Amino acid sequence: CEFKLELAADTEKLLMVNIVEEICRKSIIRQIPHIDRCVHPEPENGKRVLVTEGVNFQAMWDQEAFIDVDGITSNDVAAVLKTYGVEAARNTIVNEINNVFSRYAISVSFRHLDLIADMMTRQGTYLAFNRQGMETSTSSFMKMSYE
Amino acid sequence: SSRHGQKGVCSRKWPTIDMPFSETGIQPDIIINPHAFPSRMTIGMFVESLAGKAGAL
Amino acid sequence: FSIPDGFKKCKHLKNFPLNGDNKKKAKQQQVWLIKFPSNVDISKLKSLPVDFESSTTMTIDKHDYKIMDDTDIESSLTQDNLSNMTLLVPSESKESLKIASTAKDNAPLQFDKVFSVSETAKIPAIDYSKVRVP
Amino acid sequence: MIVPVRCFSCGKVVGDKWESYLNLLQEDELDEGTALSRLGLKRYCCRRMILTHVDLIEKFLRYNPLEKR
Amino acid sequence: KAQGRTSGKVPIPGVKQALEKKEGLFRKHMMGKRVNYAARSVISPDPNI
Amino acid sequence: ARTADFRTLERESRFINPPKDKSAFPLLQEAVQPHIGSFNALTEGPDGGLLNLGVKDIGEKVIFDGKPLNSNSGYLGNKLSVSVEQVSIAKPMSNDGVSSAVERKVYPSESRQRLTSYRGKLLLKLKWSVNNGEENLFEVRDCGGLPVMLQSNRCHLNKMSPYELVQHKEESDEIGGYFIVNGIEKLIRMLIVQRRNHPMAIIRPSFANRGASYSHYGIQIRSVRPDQTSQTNVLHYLNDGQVTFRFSWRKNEYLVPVVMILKALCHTSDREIFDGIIGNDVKDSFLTDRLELLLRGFKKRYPHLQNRTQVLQYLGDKFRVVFQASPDQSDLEVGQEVLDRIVLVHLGKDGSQDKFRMLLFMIRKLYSLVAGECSPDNPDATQHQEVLLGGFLYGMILKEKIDEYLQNIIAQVRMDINRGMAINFKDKRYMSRVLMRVNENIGS
Amino acid sequence: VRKLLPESWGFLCPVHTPDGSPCGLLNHFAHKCRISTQQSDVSRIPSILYSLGVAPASHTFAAGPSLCCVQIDGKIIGWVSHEQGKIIADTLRYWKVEGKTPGLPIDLEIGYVPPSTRGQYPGLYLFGGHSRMLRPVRYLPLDKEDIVGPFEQVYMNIAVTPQEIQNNVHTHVEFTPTNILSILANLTPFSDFNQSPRNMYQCQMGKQTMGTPGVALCHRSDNKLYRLQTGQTPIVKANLYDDYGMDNFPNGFNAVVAVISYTGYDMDDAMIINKSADERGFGYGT
Amino acid sequence: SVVGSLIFCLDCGDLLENPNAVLGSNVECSQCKAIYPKSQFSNLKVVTTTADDAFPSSLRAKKSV
Amino acid sequence: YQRLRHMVNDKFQVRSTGPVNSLTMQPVKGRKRHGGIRVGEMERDALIGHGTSFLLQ
Amino acid sequence: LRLTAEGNKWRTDILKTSVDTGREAAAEVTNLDKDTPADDPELLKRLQEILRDNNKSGILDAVTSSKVNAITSQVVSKCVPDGTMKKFPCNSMQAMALSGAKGSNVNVSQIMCLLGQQALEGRRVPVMVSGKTLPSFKPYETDAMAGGYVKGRFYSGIKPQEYYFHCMAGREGLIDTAVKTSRSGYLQRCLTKQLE
Amino acid sequence: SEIEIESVQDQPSVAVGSFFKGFRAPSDTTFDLYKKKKSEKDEFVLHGENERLEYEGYTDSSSQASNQYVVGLFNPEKKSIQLYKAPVLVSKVVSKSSKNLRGPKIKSKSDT
Amino acid sequence: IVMTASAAIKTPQMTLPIWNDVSDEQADTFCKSISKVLLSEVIDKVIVTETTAARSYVIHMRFFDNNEYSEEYDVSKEELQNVISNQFI
RNA sequence: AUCGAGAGGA
DNA sequence: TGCTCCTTCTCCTTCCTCTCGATGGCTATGAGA
DNA sequence: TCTCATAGCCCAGGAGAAGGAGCA
Ligand SMILES: [Zn+2]
Ligand SMILES: [Zn+2]
């Protein structure tokens, strides 16, 4: 495919191939938004699933004729917080920390992660433990002695 | 410490009458922990001990 | 111009014989550019076996010298006026030089076979059996 | 350091042989194990007392502040 | 946050900087306190007690 | 035919009778080879030491009194020049300080059992010129007690016998190497820096951290002088078409477009720049358009610069009030001095062709790194590192302190002239009073 | 930067390195590591390079990866091809090891950077300046001693033992492979039988041993000093103990050791001493 | 001569004013005052491509047979 | 073997009632200064985890 | 810590299979014809192409690691409980390191048979710029031991190159146990201040 | 494949210069040649002018005693060569417009 | 997870269960359906030829074969036409 | 005794 | 008239022991020989 | 009457804020 452009003499030189390469890495043909790519995983004590890097839900709600839309799991919290309310992000937190400690085969009781996930939700949404999460709590000296 | 990295702390100076005695007549100077050898993998201490007994004879 | 007193005045320049063999670009002249080391004697040789064009070795006084050809920038038929160095030939002894030309052109000229003489020493082979002792 | 008095583990007094041990090396011009056998140290726990020793204490006797150099 | 007579760069401690870090006050003298009637040693095994 | 020996008899014979000719264990004295070599290279060498080579680099100091004499603006007068012709260090010689008796030898046991330093006196040859050598003086000024290195060219235990090394209250293998100050042995630890005079092509985030249009592609080079001083020179590739240049000076840096440096080294044409950078690679239109950007942007941004002299006086105007030669020097010589002191200081004079070649080569390798036809590099490997020794840095710091003290002398003269004191610098007691007021305590 | 890189084979000690905070940084050299403190007289090097058939850079007007750039330690000389470049590199090493030309020192670092896809920019570099880390190896076509620096180490073959020298695989070999260790690393017996963090712990515990500081201890006024009375030579010792003169400074002493769990005290690095050994001078400290 | 979109003087080699930005029949030099060419030059043009680096794809890895 | 320069006679320190740093009336830092040893915040977490608040006060 | 002559016979015989392991693994990942020596110029160019890319190098080193660990676990499960010079309630080393006293059977395998591969951050040893791992290797050798497959053991003596790569593994381990001391404690303090 | 050596001229006959590619030097300018005797070779010195510019140059002292070039003239039917010793004149051009400069200051004081 | 509470995950992922009637070829067809496709994935060569009529330049793009990205990314050449038409230029 | 700098240990 | 996305600044963090140092300079007064 | 010789003092690591540069 060959085409032609015309310009005036304002710049009179610029790096044209570099401009075209900067553009061609940002031109999408079929971008399902906020989804990069799916692969073919293997089931480990479960049915057949598909791992998709990139997170979205409306386009996957759309594809119900192919995909079981009732066991959609992920790793991010904020998309689960916007989509499936407040408790599903809590279950995702518990499942992700369970995954991490299963990667080292170090058993941790679920009551402690239960307590962490319910402590991170005591003000409605997904609360941090940095200065921003301590900021909402109403203890003066506890905020003082940290940062 | 020895010459194989296996440092240590003298916990008790053991009396010579309480020492294990050999058939030749002698008793050792330092008794060392035998369980330190699998984890640390210091097999050269065997070699230094054997060569030193050879040089001592 | 009084440029410094360490400089003196040249006075002799013998003329360059262009038209001893020159005709209209068909005489197959071999006018060369030669890159010699300044270590050897010049006017006591008798021949110059540089016609092999790749392996024209000439060992001079117990040391090897490979005379390679240059199809590079001094003799390439790729770029116009690719000859950096310009053949400056005189008209008489004291007078200034002028640029030599293949015809009525006022343009530089390249040279027909350009060389490069590298000092090749022996660097002998390894005694294999002496060094692989068990 | 001077050669010690007894053995480290045994207690068989062994430094008394020392210079005579040196007399077996300097004057007698003998091998090491032969001279150690002629001294009669049949246990090797004294053979590590004599052979391993170095007379550094002579080197401390060239910096005498009482002696006029 | 001030100006400065530069090229030596020696800030003498304002009362803000004496309150902010481990070298401040809440960790150096409020929480981390060197105590009285304490001891410190190297240890040794004893399978008889 | 045994494998290993004790050598008890040879050990005892070497203990009781140390050798009176040569030190025992000649392999031991390769361990402290770098410190003692880097301290002995200060005084002797292929040119007679390198510190005296180094003091012939700082040039001269020029001051003017103000001189209302009878126009005294362009003919002000009293061109006082302060410079140094020669610096050498004496071996340690001490005495009773009163009446200056003949000084006996100094041994390191005299500093061990005094809990103080071990110092030899520092002396310099101060050239005191007045108005282009019209009144030339050669004042000798002692500096004070400078520490030396043990068993080196300025300590007496260097080549004495091991027998006397026992007799002079030292170990039989007292190799030393350390310095002694305040009764404490301390030395200067070696360092690892970038290998000198080698154009290193790197990519780092801190290059782009400086500002906009700053690519990661950079040639770092560490230009040294023959006194083992150095100067960092950084070449950034831009996203514009220019190539920027970093160089440090007195805890400050600058940014210079590189074609200013190119036409400041030598008057030339742009075809020479083309022939130097890309060569026979003319089909590669990438770097061709980069050089086209460079030349058109240079001769479009400032077309009023058309030789070397205009650009050098432009540099001398732009760089007048920081190099501190402002009340006297013409801007042409100021620019030539800065190009002598910043760009490619491994040549000095008669370097302009080779400096020009080196700069075009660094531009070629920089744009080659942009196009990705060479791998990135790393200062972590031993391929591109070098060792900074103790004595070389010691001589550098002493050069620095001497130059600082001469500048402090010039500052004292500038403070004195504005009061209305003695105008003429020929006077001996005036100069003696000025040197009395100044502090020359270099040893402390 | 803390990680060990494989270009340090011969120059820095892979074993002798502290732990804790300076771990990975604070390296140590080998006993065959000379730090050159001299400008070697390499002024005749460009002249013999022009003898070797190199056109001058003034008369060249070229710069590119196809043309090998011939430099001396920060100063461009000329432009050649790469085949003749490596011929000149190895022939110049041949003229380095053999004393044929008097204006050429033994310690000229000849780095031939070959044309390789995604490597460093090519060229033949010659280093003859100060502060160059130098080390000797054995050179095979003349079978002598060869000074090699690290910038030419990657692009050239350095073997380990003579019996595995293979056909056109190496041009260099070590005198002894134990040259790759430091001074204190060689004083650990049978280092190649141990897990290397224990060798690092050994080469760091060796620098804290209360032993022999000297024999001039009646003339010094040191702040704190430590003397061990009883000093002994190890029977199990390396040859560098005899060579580099640790004989003047006995650090410790030999002992008879039964590897046994007899006491019940020796668990997790403990060790037990006979009491009469203590009572008869088991390293009395001062 | 002209090299791509780059041309200089045949004597001094200085950079010149753009022939597609002049009004006269020639090109005046920035330092000397000479006329080269007579404006009947072969027109200013280049031919440039990509570098086979900036375009990643698994399809590109399919070409690695 | 070889004897390390670390010993037990140096590294032990103890205190009953020593010098107090009268800037804050807090026990001073230093072994030769007769200084006590330091509690960390992680050790405060360890004492809250047992709940032993009387010993914590 | 000794075997019988048949134990060392098995050790040498199965380590004779480690000659072309990296060769055939590189032939696998390169996707060319198998049974090709370590000097093929198209193979060496493609190995340079693999080496200059990071993830391609990771794939090659994962395949090499899988094959050499297959050989390793083969030798371990063959020789280590079976062909000892003295059996289990006389072999005090196995009597220690089986009941959970010190370490595992991995240490017994590294003493008695071979160390294996020194996995610096889960892969093969890093390379110099010219396609050489050590100065004693010709460029792009297809030996697994050139990638660090330590065939030697802590009893019969290890090669110097094996010792050098083991020093790399030890320095990596010391860096890893130094970096994780002041790391997790900050997170622990940050989520003790919240939950007190 | 052998080529005979006929005549080796010892006197300076042809010396080769070098300016740049595309340089042709019309008839207005001349190639002024000066001598220097350092007692082993001759640094030929090139000078020249035209209506607006001026070129000067020489042969460098680090190369001409380490290099030598030969002008060759061969005839195959004669099978003969003339061989001239030749240094290469390296010379650069400046302009007559390059005689412009600023004064040694810009009249600054402590207020400036 | 617990301290920072960040939304910019390093590798955010999603695990979608599939039904039992869907075969592996059908699920991989869905995987080629869901996937994000960049333009430079189907670009072999970009050739820019400037000529200065004022300053201008002609762009020639050599793509790959149509069946390749048709089978791999489910893209026709007229979808390529429309995406050059809409967003690229 | 404050700040730097250095060293060393679990 | 009012309401968003693109640039800067502006923020913050394992335990112990020991040693060793730690402002320059511009003016007074004040005898010595 | 100057020369000393001193007193008395002047390169992570993103997350927020916060406000300009365009848009219904
Ligand atoms: Zn005994
Ligand atoms: Zn012109």
UniProtKB/Swiss-Prot annotation, chain B:
It comes from the Eukaryota. It is found in: Nucleus, Nucleolus. Three distinct zinc-containing RNA polymerases are found in eukaryotic nuclei: polymerase I for the ribosomal RNA precursor, polymerase II for the mRNA precursor, and polymerase III for 5S and tRNA genes. Present with 14100 molecules/cell in log phase SD medium. DNA-dependent RNA polymerases catalyze the transcription of DNA into RNA using the four ribonucleoside triphosphates as substrates. Component of RNA polymerase I (Pol I) which synthesizes ribosomal RNA precursors. Besides, RNA polymerase I has intrinsic RNA cleavage activity. RPA190 and RPA135 both contribute to the polymerase catalytic activity and together form the Pol I active center. In addition, subunit RPA12 contributes a catalytic zinc ribbon that is required for RNA cleavage by Pol I. Belongs to the RNA polymerase beta chain family. This is DNA-directed RNA polymerase I subunit RPA135. The chain holds residues 918 to 974 of 1203 of the full protein.
From Swiss-Prot, chain D:
SUPFAM superfamilies: RNA polymerase subunit RPB10. It is found in: Nucleus, Nucleolus. Zn(2+) binds at residues 7, 10, 45-46. GO terms for cellular component: nucleoplasm; nucleus; RNA polymerase I complex; RNA polymerase II, core complex; RNA polymerase III complex. Keywords: DNA-directed RNA polymerase, Isopeptide bond, Metal-binding, Nucleus, Ribosome biogenesis, Transcription, Ubl conjugation, Zinc. The keyword Ubl conjugation applies. It holds the Pfam family RNA_pol_N. Its main location: nucleus. There is a cross-link at residue 59 (Glycyl lysine isopeptide (Lys-Gly) (interchain with G-Cter in ubiquitin)). GO terms for biological process: nucleolar large rRNA transcription by RNA polymerase I; ribosome biogenesis; RNA-templated transcription; termination of RNA polymerase I transcription; termination of RNA polymerase III transcription; transcription by RNA polymerase I; transcription by RNA polymerase II; transcription by RNA polymerase III. GO terms for molecular function: DNA binding; DNA-directed RNA polymerase activity; zinc ion binding. It comes from the Eukaryota. Belongs to the archaeal Rpo10/eukaryotic RPB10 RNA polymerase subunit family. Present with 5300 molecules/cell in log phase SD medium. This is DNA-directed RNA polymerases I, II, and III subunit RPABC5. The gene is RPB10.
UniProtKB/Swiss-Prot annotation, chain E:
It comes from the Eukaryota. Coiled coil: none annotated. It is found in: Nucleus, Nucleolus. DNA-dependent RNA polymerases catalyze the transcription of DNA into RNA using the four ribonucleoside triphosphates as substrates. Component of RNA polymerase I (Pol I) which synthesizes ribosomal RNA precursors. Besides, RNA polymerase I has intrinsic RNA cleavage activity. RPA190 and RPA135 both contribute to the polymerase catalytic activity and together form the Pol I active center. In addition, subunit RPA12 contributes a catalytic zinc ribbon that is required for RNA cleavage by Pol I. Component of the RNA polymerase I (Pol I) complex consisting of 14 subunits: RPA135, RPA190, RPC40, RPA14, RPB5, RPO26, RPA43, RPB8, RPA12, RPB10, RPC19, RPC10, RPA49 and RPA34. The complex is composed of a horseshoe-shaped core containing ten subunits (RPA135, RPA190, RPB5, RPO26, RPB8, RPB10, RPC10, RPA12, RPC19 and RPC40) where RPA135 and RPA190 form the DNA-binding cleft. Outside of the core, RPA14 and RPA43 form the stalk that mediates interactions with transcription initiation factors and newly synthesized RNA. Belongs to the RNA polymerase beta' chain family. Present with 2840 molecules/cell in log phase SD medium. This is DNA-directed RNA polymerase I subunit RPA190. The gene is RPA190.
Curated annotation (Swiss-Prot), chain K:
The modification Phosphoserine is found at residue 27. It is found in: Nucleus, Nucleolus. It comes from the Eukaryota. Belongs to the eukaryotic RPA49/POLR1E RNA polymerase subunit family. DNA-dependent RNA polymerases catalyze the transcription of DNA into RNA using the four ribonucleoside triphosphates as substrates. Component of RNA polymerase I (Pol I) which synthesizes ribosomal RNA precursors. Besides, RNA polymerase I has intrinsic RNA cleavage activity. The heterodimer formed by RPA34 and RPA49 stimulates transcript elongation by Pol I. Subunit RPA49 can bind both single-stranded and double-stranded DNA. Component of the RNA polymerase I (Pol I) complex consisting of 14 subunits: RPA135, RPA190, RPC40, RPA14, RPB5, RPO26, RPA43, RPB8, RPA12, RPB10, RPC19, RPC10, RPA49 and RPA34. The complex is composed of a horseshoe-shaped core containing ten subunits (RPA135, RPA190, RPB5, RPO26, RPB8, RPB10, RPC10, RPA12, RPC19 and RPC40) where RPA135 and RPA190 form the DNA-binding cleft. Outside of the core, RPA14 and RPA43 form the stalk that mediates interactions with transcription initiation factors and newly synthesized RNA. This is DNA-directed RNA polymerase I subunit RPA49. It comes from Saccharomyces cerevisiae (strain ATCC 204508 / S288c) (Baker's yeast). The chain holds residues 8 to 119 of 415 of the full protein.
